[PDB]
Amino acid sequence: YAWNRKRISNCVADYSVLYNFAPFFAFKCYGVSPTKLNDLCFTNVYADS
Amino acid sequence: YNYRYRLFRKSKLKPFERDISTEIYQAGNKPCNGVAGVNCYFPLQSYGF
């Protein structure tokens, strides 16, 4: 309910760290395949968690 | 929902080209076994009629 709106900007993304977690963890995506954001850029990222 | 369209493919289809290959694009060592999740996305989707 008080979800943290963590900002992600001015830094570089490391989606290769998104793996190695517990097996068969849900990894859904909408609007883009998860493996394409390495070749895509954005103004900001919200790391709500 | 009888009509279904091929949502995803490894490469773009050529002009006037038909592809009925239903082989899954397994991006990892995990076998899909029909499970939607990590490295496993179904290439076909039913029409939202």
GROMACS .gro file of N, CA, C and O in nm:
model
  392
    1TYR      N    1   0.083  -0.120   0.000
    1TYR     CA    2   0.000   0.000   0.000
    1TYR      C    3   0.086   0.126   0.000
    1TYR      O    4   0.058   0.221  -0.073
    2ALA      N    5   0.192   0.127   0.081
    2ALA     CA    6   0.293   0.233   0.076
    2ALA      C    7   0.411   0.190  -0.010
    2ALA      O    8   0.526   0.193   0.034
    3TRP      N    9   0.383   0.150  -0.133
    3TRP     CA   10   0.486   0.094  -0.219
    3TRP      C   11   0.592   0.198  -0.252
    3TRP      O   12   0.562   0.315  -0.276
    4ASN      N   13   0.718   0.153  -0.252
    4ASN     CA   14   0.831   0.242  -0.274
    4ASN      C   15   0.843   0.274  -0.423
    4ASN      O   16   0.864   0.184  -0.505
    5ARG      N   17   0.829   0.402  -0.457
    5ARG     CA   18   0.849   0.448  -0.594
    5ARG      C   19   0.996   0.484  -0.611
    5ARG      O   20   1.036   0.601  -0.608
    6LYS      N   21   1.078   0.381  -0.624
    6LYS     CA   22   1.221   0.400  -0.640
    6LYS      C   23   1.252   0.448  -0.781
    6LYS      O   24   1.202   0.392  -0.879
    7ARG      N   25   1.335   0.552  -0.790
    7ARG     CA   26   1.371   0.608  -0.919
    7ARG      C   27   1.493   0.538  -0.977
    7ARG      O   28   1.583   0.496  -0.904
    8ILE      N   29   1.494   0.525  -1.109
    8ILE     CA   30   1.607   0.467  -1.181
    8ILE      C   31   1.637   0.557  -1.300
    8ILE      O   32   1.562   0.558  -1.399
    9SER      N   33   1.745   0.634  -1.290
    9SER     CA   34   1.785   0.725  -1.396
    9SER      C   35   1.934   0.752  -1.383
    9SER      O   36   1.994   0.732  -1.276
   10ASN      N   37   1.995   0.794  -1.494
   10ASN     CA   38   2.135   0.835  -1.500
   10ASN      C   39   2.228   0.716  -1.480
   10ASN      O   40   2.350   0.729  -1.493
   11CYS      N   41   2.173   0.598  -1.453
   11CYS     CA   42   2.251   0.476  -1.437
   11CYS      C   43   2.226   0.383  -1.555
   11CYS      O   44   2.139   0.406  -1.639
   12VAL      N   45   2.305   0.276  -1.560
   12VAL     CA   46   2.296   0.178  -1.667
   12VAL      C   47   2.232   0.051  -1.613
   12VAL      O   48   2.252   0.013  -1.497
   13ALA      N   49   2.152  -0.014  -1.697
   13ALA     CA   50   2.075  -0.131  -1.657
   13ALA      C   51   2.157  -0.258  -1.677
   13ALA      O   52   2.241  -0.267  -1.766
   14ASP      N   53   2.129  -0.357  -1.593
   14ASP     CA   54   2.203  -0.483  -1.587
   14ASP      C   55   2.107  -0.601  -1.581
   14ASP      O   56   2.117  -0.688  -1.494
   15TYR      N   57   2.012  -0.606  -1.676
   15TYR     CA   58   1.908  -0.709  -1.676
   15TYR      C   59   1.963  -0.850  -1.659
   15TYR      O   60   1.887  -0.940  -1.621
   16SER      N   61   2.092  -0.872  -1.687
   16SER     CA   62   2.151  -1.003  -1.663
   16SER      C   63   2.149  -1.042  -1.516
   16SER      O   64   2.167  -1.160  -1.484
   17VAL      N   65   2.128  -0.946  -1.426
   17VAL     CA   66   2.116  -0.979  -1.284
   17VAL      C   67   1.975  -1.025  -1.248
   17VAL      O   68   1.955  -1.079  -1.139
   18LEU      N   69   1.878  -1.007  -1.338
   18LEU     CA   70   1.740  -1.045  -1.308
   18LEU      C   71   1.722  -1.196  -1.292
   18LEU      O   72   1.620  -1.238  -1.236
   19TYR      N   73   1.816  -1.277  -1.339
   19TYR     CA   74   1.810  -1.421  -1.325
   19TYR      C   75   1.879  -1.463  -1.195
   19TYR      O   76   1.904  -1.380  -1.106
   20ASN      N   77   1.907  -1.593  -1.183
   20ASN     CA   78   1.970  -1.663  -1.071
   20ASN      C   79   1.883  -1.664  -0.945
   20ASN      O   80   1.930  -1.709  -0.840
   21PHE      N   81   1.759  -1.618  -0.953
   21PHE     CA   82   1.669  -1.620  -0.838
   21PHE      C   83   1.607  -1.759  -0.825
   21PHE      O   84   1.652  -1.856  -0.886
   22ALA      N   85   1.503  -1.770  -0.742
   22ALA     CA   86   1.438  -1.898  -0.721
   22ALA      C   87   1.381  -1.950  -0.852
   22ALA      O   88   1.326  -1.872  -0.931
   23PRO      N   89   1.392  -2.080  -0.880
   23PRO     CA   90   1.350  -2.132  -1.011
   23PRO      C   91   1.202  -2.109  -1.037
   23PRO      O   92   1.119  -2.109  -0.946
   24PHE      N   93   1.170  -2.089  -1.165
   24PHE     CA   94   1.033  -2.068  -1.212
   24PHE      C   95   0.968  -1.948  -1.143
   24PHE      O   96   0.850  -1.951  -1.107
   25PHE      N   97   1.045  -1.841  -1.124
   25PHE     CA   98   0.988  -1.717  -1.076
   25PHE      C   99   0.917  -1.645  -1.190
   25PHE      O  100   0.966  -1.642  -1.303
   26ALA      N  101   0.801  -1.588  -1.160
   26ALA     CA  102   0.724  -1.519  -1.263
   26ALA      C  103   0.804  -1.402  -1.320
   26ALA      O  104   0.856  -1.319  -1.245
   27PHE      N  105   0.813  -1.397  -1.452
   27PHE     CA  106   0.895  -1.300  -1.524
   27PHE      C  107   0.816  -1.240  -1.640
   27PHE      O  108   0.863  -1.233  -1.754
   28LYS      N  109   0.694  -1.195  -1.613
   28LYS     CA  110   0.608  -1.153  -1.722
   28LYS      C  111   0.646  -1.013  -1.769
   28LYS      O  112   0.708  -0.935  -1.696
   29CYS      N  113   0.608  -0.981  -1.892
   29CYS     CA  114   0.635  -0.850  -1.949
   29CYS      C  115   0.520  -0.810  -2.040
   29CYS      O  116   0.448  -0.894  -2.094
   30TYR      N  117   0.502  -0.679  -2.055
   30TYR     CA  118   0.396  -0.623  -2.138
   30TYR      C  119   0.451  -0.506  -2.217
   30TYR      O  120   0.510  -0.414  -2.159
   31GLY      N  121   0.432  -0.510  -2.349
   31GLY     CA  122   0.481  -0.406  -2.437
   31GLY      C  123   0.619  -0.429  -2.493
   31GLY      O  124   0.657  -0.360  -2.589
   32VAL      N  125   0.695  -0.524  -2.438
   32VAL     CA  126   0.831  -0.551  -2.484
   32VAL      C  127   0.878  -0.685  -2.428
   32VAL      O  128   0.844  -0.721  -2.315
   33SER      N  129   0.954  -0.759  -2.508
   33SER     CA  130   1.016  -0.881  -2.458
   33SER      C  131   1.123  -0.846  -2.355
   33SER      O  132   1.191  -0.744  -2.369
   34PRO      N  133   1.140  -0.928  -2.251
   34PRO     CA  134   1.238  -0.894  -2.146
   34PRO      C  135   1.381  -0.883  -2.196
   34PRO      O  136   1.461  -0.809  -2.135
   35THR      N  137   1.417  -0.952  -2.303
   35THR     CA  138   1.554  -0.954  -2.352
   35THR      C  139   1.585  -0.842  -2.450
   35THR      O  140   1.698  -0.836  -2.501
   36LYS      N  141   1.490  -0.753  -2.477
   36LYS     CA  142   1.511  -0.644  -2.572
   36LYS      C  143   1.544  -0.511  -2.507
   36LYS      O  144   1.593  -0.421  -2.575
   37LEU      N  145   1.518  -0.496  -2.377
   37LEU     CA  146   1.546  -0.370  -2.309
   37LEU      C  147   1.694  -0.337  -2.307
   37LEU      O  148   1.730  -0.221  -2.282
   38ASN      N  149   1.781  -0.435  -2.332
   38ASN     CA  150   1.923  -0.405  -2.346
   38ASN      C  151   1.950  -0.314  -2.465
   38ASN      O  152   2.044  -0.234  -2.462
   39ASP      N  153   1.869  -0.326  -2.570
   39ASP     CA  154   1.882  -0.243  -2.689
   39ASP      C  155   1.783  -0.127  -2.691
   39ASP      O  156   1.769  -0.060  -2.794
   40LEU      N  157   1.713  -0.102  -2.580
   40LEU     CA  158   1.614   0.004  -2.572
   40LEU      C  159   1.648   0.100  -2.459
   40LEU      O  160   1.707   0.061  -2.358
   41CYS      N  161   1.610   0.226  -2.478
   41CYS     CA  162   1.638   0.331  -2.382
   41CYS      C  163   1.508   0.400  -2.342
   41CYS      O  164   1.409   0.399  -2.415
   42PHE      N  165   1.510   0.461  -2.223
   42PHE     CA  166   1.395   0.533  -2.170
   42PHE      C  167   1.444   0.652  -2.089
   42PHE      O  168   1.561   0.659  -2.051
   43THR      N  169   1.353   0.746  -2.065
   43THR     CA  170   1.388   0.862  -1.983
   43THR      C  171   1.406   0.822  -1.837
   43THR      O  172   1.503   0.862  -1.773
   44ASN      N  173   1.312   0.744  -1.784
   44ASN     CA  174   1.317   0.706  -1.643
   44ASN      C  175   1.265   0.564  -1.627
   44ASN      O  176   1.199   0.510  -1.715
   45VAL      N  177   1.297   0.505  -1.512
   45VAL     CA  178   1.243   0.374  -1.476
   45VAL      C  179   1.191   0.382  -1.333
   45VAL      O  180   1.257   0.437  -1.244
   46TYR      N  181   1.072   0.329  -1.311
   46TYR     CA  182   1.014   0.316  -1.178
   46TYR      C  183   1.035   0.172  -1.131
   46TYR      O  184   0.980   0.078  -1.189
   47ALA      N  185   1.117   0.156  -1.027
   47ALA     CA  186   1.143   0.025  -0.968
   47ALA      C  187   1.053   0.004  -0.845
   47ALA      O  188   1.100  -0.013  -0.733
   48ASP      N  189   0.923   0.008  -0.870
   48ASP     CA  190   0.827  -0.022  -0.765
   48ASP      C  191   0.848  -0.165  -0.716
   48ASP      O  192   0.863  -0.257  -0.796
   49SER      N  193   0.850  -0.183  -0.584
   49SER     CA  194   0.880  -0.313  -0.528
   49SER      C  195   0.807  -0.330  -0.396
   49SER      O  196   0.798  -0.235  -0.317
   50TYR      N  197  -1.335  -1.779  -3.057
   50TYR     CA  198  -1.194  -1.797  -3.030
   50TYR      C  199  -1.130  -1.902  -3.121
   50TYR      O  200  -1.012  -1.934  -3.101
   51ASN      N  201  -1.204  -1.955  -3.218
   51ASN     CA  202  -1.148  -2.055  -3.308
   51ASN      C  203  -1.034  -1.997  -3.391
   51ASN      O  204  -0.932  -2.064  -3.412
   52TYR      N  205  -1.049  -1.874  -3.439
   52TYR     CA  206  -0.944  -1.811  -3.516
   52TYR      C  207  -0.826  -1.775  -3.426
   52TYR      O  208  -0.845  -1.714  -3.320
   53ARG      N  209  -0.706  -1.812  -3.468
   53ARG     CA  210  -0.585  -1.789  -3.390
   53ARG      C  211  -0.478  -1.731  -3.480
   53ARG      O  212  -0.468  -1.767  -3.598
   54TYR      N  213  -0.397  -1.642  -3.423
   54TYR     CA  214  -0.292  -1.574  -3.497
   54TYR      C  215  -0.157  -1.601  -3.432
   54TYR      O  216  -0.147  -1.611  -3.310
   55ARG      N  217  -0.053  -1.613  -3.515
   55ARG     CA  218   0.082  -1.637  -3.466
   55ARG      C  219   0.138  -1.506  -3.412
   55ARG      O  220   0.173  -1.416  -3.489
   56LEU      N  221   0.147  -1.495  -3.280
   56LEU     CA  222   0.187  -1.369  -3.218
   56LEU      C  223   0.337  -1.344  -3.233
   56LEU      O  224   0.378  -1.232  -3.262
   57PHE      N  225   0.419  -1.447  -3.214
   57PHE     CA  226   0.563  -1.430  -3.204
   57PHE      C  227   0.636  -1.528  -3.295
   57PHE      O  228   0.591  -1.641  -3.315
   58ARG      N  229   0.748  -1.483  -3.350
   58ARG     CA  230   0.839  -1.567  -3.426
   58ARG      C  231   0.981  -1.520  -3.401
   58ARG      O  232   1.005  -1.407  -3.359
   59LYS      N  233   1.077  -1.610  -3.428
   59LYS     CA  234   1.218  -1.574  -3.410
   59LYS      C  235   1.261  -1.464  -3.506
   59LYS      O  236   1.336  -1.374  -3.468
   60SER      N  237   1.214  -1.469  -3.631
   60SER     CA  238   1.251  -1.371  -3.732
   60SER      C  239   1.126  -1.324  -3.804
   60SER      O  240   1.022  -1.390  -3.802
   61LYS      N  241   1.137  -1.207  -3.866
   61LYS     CA  242   1.025  -1.150  -3.940
   61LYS      C  243   0.992  -1.235  -4.062
   61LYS      O  244   1.081  -1.288  -4.129
   62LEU      N  245   0.863  -1.247  -4.092
   62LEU     CA  246   0.820  -1.323  -4.208
   62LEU      C  247   0.851  -1.247  -4.337
   62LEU      O  248   0.838  -1.125  -4.343
   63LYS      N  249   0.891  -1.322  -4.439
   63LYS     CA  250   0.916  -1.263  -4.570
   63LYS      C  251   0.785  -1.224  -4.636
   63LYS      O  252   0.678  -1.271  -4.597
   64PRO      N  253   0.789  -1.134  -4.734
   64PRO     CA  254   0.666  -1.100  -4.808
   64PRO      C  255   0.607  -1.223  -4.875
   64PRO      O  256   0.678  -1.305  -4.934
   65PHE      N  257   0.474  -1.235  -4.866
   65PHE     CA  258   0.400  -1.347  -4.925
   65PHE      C  259   0.456  -1.481  -4.879
   65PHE      O  260   0.472  -1.574  -4.959
   66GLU      N  261   0.486  -1.492  -4.750
   66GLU     CA  262   0.545  -1.613  -4.693
   66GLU      C  263   0.452  -1.669  -4.586
   66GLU      O  264   0.398  -1.594  -4.504
   67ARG      N  265   0.435  -1.801  -4.587
   67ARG     CA  266   0.354  -1.871  -4.490
   67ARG      C  267   0.442  -1.963  -4.407
   67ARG      O  268   0.524  -2.038  -4.461
   68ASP      N  269   0.425  -1.957  -4.275
   68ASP     CA  270   0.502  -2.040  -4.183
   68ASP      C  271   0.406  -2.105  -4.084
   68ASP      O  272   0.337  -2.035  -4.010
   69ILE      N  273   0.403  -2.238  -4.083
   69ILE     CA  274   0.319  -2.314  -3.992
   69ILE      C  275   0.402  -2.390  -3.889
   69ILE      O  276   0.349  -2.477  -3.819
   70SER      N  277   0.531  -2.359  -3.878
   70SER     CA  278   0.617  -2.426  -3.781
   70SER      C  279   0.582  -2.379  -3.641
   70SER      O  280   0.592  -2.259  -3.610
   71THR      N  281   0.541  -2.472  -3.555
   71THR     CA  282   0.497  -2.441  -3.420
   71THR      C  283   0.605  -2.470  -3.316
   71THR      O  284   0.574  -2.478  -3.196
   72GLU      N  285   0.730  -2.487  -3.359
   72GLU     CA  286   0.838  -2.512  -3.265
   72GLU      C  287   0.856  -2.392  -3.172
   72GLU      O  288   0.860  -2.277  -3.216
   73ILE      N  289   0.867  -2.420  -3.042
   73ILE     CA  290   0.880  -2.315  -2.942
   73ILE      C  291   1.021  -2.259  -2.945
   73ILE      O  292   1.117  -2.328  -2.982
   74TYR      N  293   1.035  -2.132  -2.908
   74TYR     CA  294   1.165  -2.065  -2.900
   74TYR      C  295   1.210  -2.069  -2.755
   74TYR      O  296   1.185  -1.977  -2.677
   75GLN      N  297   1.277  -2.178  -2.718
   75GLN     CA  298   1.325  -2.196  -2.581
   75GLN      C  299   1.456  -2.119  -2.565
   75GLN      O  300   1.559  -2.157  -2.622
   76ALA      N  301   1.452  -2.010  -2.488
   76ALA     CA  302   1.568  -1.925  -2.470
   76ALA      C  303   1.661  -1.972  -2.359
   76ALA      O  304   1.763  -1.907  -2.334
   77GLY      N  305   1.628  -2.083  -2.292
   77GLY     CA  306   1.712  -2.133  -2.185
   77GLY      C  307   1.712  -2.284  -2.176
   77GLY      O  308   1.656  -2.353  -2.262
   78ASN      N  309   1.774  -2.338  -2.071
   78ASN     CA  310   1.778  -2.482  -2.051
   78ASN      C  311   1.647  -2.538  -1.999
   78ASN      O  312   1.626  -2.660  -2.006
   79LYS      N  313   1.558  -2.453  -1.949
   79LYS     CA  314   1.432  -2.500  -1.891
   79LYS      C  315   1.337  -2.544  -2.002
   79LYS      O  316   1.304  -2.464  -2.089
   80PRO      N  317   1.291  -2.669  -2.002
   80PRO     CA  318   1.192  -2.711  -2.102
   80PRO      C  319   1.058  -2.644  -2.076
   80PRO      O  320   1.013  -2.632  -1.962
   81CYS      N  321   0.994  -2.598  -2.185
   81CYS     CA  322   0.868  -2.526  -2.172
   81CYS      C  323   0.757  -2.616  -2.120
   81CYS      O  324   0.688  -2.582  -2.023
   82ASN      N  325   0.738  -2.732  -2.184
   82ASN     CA  326   0.632  -2.827  -2.147
   82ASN      C  327   0.495  -2.759  -2.144
   82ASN      O  328   0.407  -2.798  -2.067
   83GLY      N  329   0.476  -2.658  -2.228
   83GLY     CA  330   0.351  -2.584  -2.232
   83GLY      C  331   0.334  -2.482  -2.122
   83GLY      O  332   0.226  -2.423  -2.112
   84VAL      N  333   0.435  -2.460  -2.039
   84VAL     CA  334   0.426  -2.365  -1.928
   84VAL      C  335   0.475  -2.229  -1.975
   84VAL      O  336   0.586  -2.217  -2.029
   85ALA      N  337   0.393  -2.126  -1.954
   85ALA     CA  338   0.430  -1.990  -1.989
   85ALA      C  339   0.507  -1.928  -1.873
   85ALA      O  340   0.458  -1.925  -1.759
   86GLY      N  341   0.628  -1.881  -1.901
   86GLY     CA  342   0.713  -1.826  -1.797
   86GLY      C  343   0.850  -1.785  -1.845
   86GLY      O  344   0.864  -1.717  -1.947
   87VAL      N  345   0.954  -1.827  -1.772
   87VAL     CA  346   1.090  -1.786  -1.805
   87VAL      C  347   1.137  -1.859  -1.930
   87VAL      O  348   1.132  -1.982  -1.938
   88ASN      N  349   1.182  -1.782  -2.029
   88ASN     CA  350   1.238  -1.833  -2.154
   88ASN      C  351   1.141  -1.922  -2.231
   88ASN      O  352   1.183  -2.007  -2.309
   89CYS      N  353   1.010  -1.903  -2.211
   89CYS     CA  354   0.909  -1.987  -2.275
   89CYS      C  355   0.785  -1.902  -2.301
   89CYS      O  356   0.711  -1.870  -2.207
   90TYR      N  357   0.763  -1.867  -2.427
   90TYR     CA  358   0.646  -1.791  -2.469
   90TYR      C  359   0.581  -1.861  -2.588
   90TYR      O  360   0.650  -1.895  -2.685
   91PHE      N  361   0.451  -1.883  -2.580
   91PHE     CA  362   0.380  -1.952  -2.687
   91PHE      C  363   0.373  -1.862  -2.810
   91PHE      O  364   0.345  -1.743  -2.798
   92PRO      N  365   0.397  -1.916  -2.930
   92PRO     CA  366   0.396  -1.832  -3.051
   92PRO      C  367   0.258  -1.806  -3.109
   92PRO      O  368   0.247  -1.729  -3.204
   93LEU      N  369   0.153  -1.867  -3.055
   93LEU     CA  370   0.018  -1.852  -3.106
   93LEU      C  371  -0.073  -1.795  -2.998
   93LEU      O  372  -0.055  -1.820  -2.879
   94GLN      N  373  -0.173  -1.717  -3.042
   94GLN     CA  374  -0.269  -1.657  -2.951
   94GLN      C  375  -0.407  -1.656  -3.015
   94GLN      O  376  -0.420  -1.626  -3.134
   95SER      N  377  -0.508  -1.690  -2.937
   95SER     CA  378  -0.645  -1.689  -2.986
   95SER      C  379  -0.694  -1.545  -3.004
   95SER      O  380  -0.656  -1.454  -2.930
   96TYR      N  381  -0.779  -1.526  -3.104
   96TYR     CA  382  -0.835  -1.394  -3.131
   96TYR      C  383  -0.925  -1.350  -3.016
   96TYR      O  384  -0.999  -1.430  -2.959
   97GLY      N  385  -0.917  -1.221  -2.982
   97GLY     CA  386  -1.001  -1.166  -2.878
   97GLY      C  387  -1.137  -1.123  -2.929
   97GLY      O  388  -1.175  -1.006  -2.916
   98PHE      N  389  -1.211  -1.217  -2.988
   98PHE     CA  390  -1.342  -1.187  -3.046
   98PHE      C  391  -1.449  -1.195  -2.938
   98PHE      O  392  -1.538  -1.282  -2.937
   0.00000   0.00000   0.00000
